[PDB]
Amino acid sequence: ELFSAP
Amino acid sequence: ELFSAP
Amino acid sequence: GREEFVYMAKLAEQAERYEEMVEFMEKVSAAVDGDELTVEERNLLSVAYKNVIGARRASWRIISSIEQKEESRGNDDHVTAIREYRSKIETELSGICDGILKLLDSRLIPAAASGDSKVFYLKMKGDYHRYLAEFKTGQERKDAAEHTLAAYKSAQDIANAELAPTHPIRLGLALNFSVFYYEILNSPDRACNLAKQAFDEAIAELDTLGEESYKDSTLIMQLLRDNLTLWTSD
Amino acid sequence: GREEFVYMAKLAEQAERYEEMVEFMEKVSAAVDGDELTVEERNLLSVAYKNVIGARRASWRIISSIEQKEESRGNDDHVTAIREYRSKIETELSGICDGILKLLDSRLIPAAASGDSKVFYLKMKGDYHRYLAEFKTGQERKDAAEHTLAAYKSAQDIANAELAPTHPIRLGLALNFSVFYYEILNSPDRACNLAKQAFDEAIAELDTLGEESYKDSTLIMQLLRDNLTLWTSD
């Protein structure tokens, strides 16, 4: 559920 | 936007 | 071996690498000479080709819209570039259909021993001749439309004779056959009549159901209604 | 040549044929000797690579999970087949990372003339070295981790000195840098502090943003918060 940059 | 069989 | 390639096909599916899923099932079919694919294998093969062709169909549609818009603007340089790109997608579409049709004509259809399998594969043959008709032109389009009508109408004869009106395969054939009428043959009336007929024949014996068997039938029947709803109000 | 291959990249994007979008953007970067890619061209190149690598990363994750379940509680021949398949996905991952990293080291980073573009391309270098670190082992992982931190730290130095704390590129760098700490280096404390620090320094001067730039900065900052919320509860 961890996000990085788009 | 018609539907054919799955 | 058949078992190994089935497992690889399931790994490719999970990974959503459907081009490789096609290859693994292509090898499952080769390992099964004469004998029929299992329901599981039969379904994996169709899931493998559906996604593969589904992506190119999506691409072809969006590219065609862009071509027409650019034609309306007069950008000849853009239209030239779009047509060459569309032609590339059409070449892939042709190859994907040729692969499954070659397998259907030479192995799967000849080996189908039950009405169930006969209506499944013939239906699939019509489906992939229909996809060809979506983009082909001239004689190649008419040849594809006729192969579709031949395969669908044949599959229909067996379905009415050996499959219950609620059988998912029979309902799926009627749905796709009706779509074929509307989109390829531009016969909306024939499309609505077939979609309603297949639906009415189903509701007649629908209440004679289990509890978890008509999950698949109800799904197809709702699609028939949705298409009818759209076709009836133009 | 340049303008034609940009258009082709845009078509490939609409078609969701991203491997071809990479090829078109590779030809764009080759046609731009010394000069910098436009913001439009620069953004098309990362969307292309982002999606190409994004697919294989998704595939690699699911295959790895299946390998571990089979290894713990299942057949060894299945594990053997999975490992060969995972190894094929890792070869594609390596190839994709290799393509953009070569382009970054030999053209894009050398040609970056503003702090804006320098942080962008250095941040990208770290991103694709990080993607290598996600699956590489042994020396290749160590080499990837070292290159990521070097590229991120370099980028951070320029970002702090020449980019506003609300600039999306600077915020994106902080987000990915913080993810690198948590996932690759297993340094949760440094991950949380860098995310909070980049988030606090942003909220301080968020009043200066307009309405089209307030949307870009608030999007990255919400991701920083989401990660912090998860990291702070472990």
Numbering used by the authors:
A (entry chain K), B (entry chain L): 1267 to 1272
C (entry chain B), D (entry chain A): 4 to 237
Which lines from the publication concern this structure?
Brassinosteroids (BRs) are vital plant steroid hormones sensed at the cell surface by a membrane signaling complex comprising the receptor kinase BRI1 and a SERK family co-receptor kinase. In this study, we use quantitative ligand binding assays to define the minimal 14-3-3 binding sites in the N-terminal lobe of the BRI1 kinase domain, in BKI1, and in BZR1 from Arabidopsis thaliana. 14-3-3λ and 14-3-3 ω isoform complex crystal structures reveal that BKI1 and BZR1 bind as canonical type II 14-3-3 linear motifs.
No binding was detected to either double phosphorylated or unphosphorylated versions of this peptide, suggesting that pBKI1265−272 represents the minimal 14-3-3 binding motif in BKI1. We found that pBKI1265−272 bound 14-3-3λ and 14-3-3 ω with slightly lower dissociation constants when compared to 14-3-3κ. We found Arg136 and Tyr137 to form hydrogen bond networks with pS270 in pBKI1 and with pS173 in BZR1, respectively.
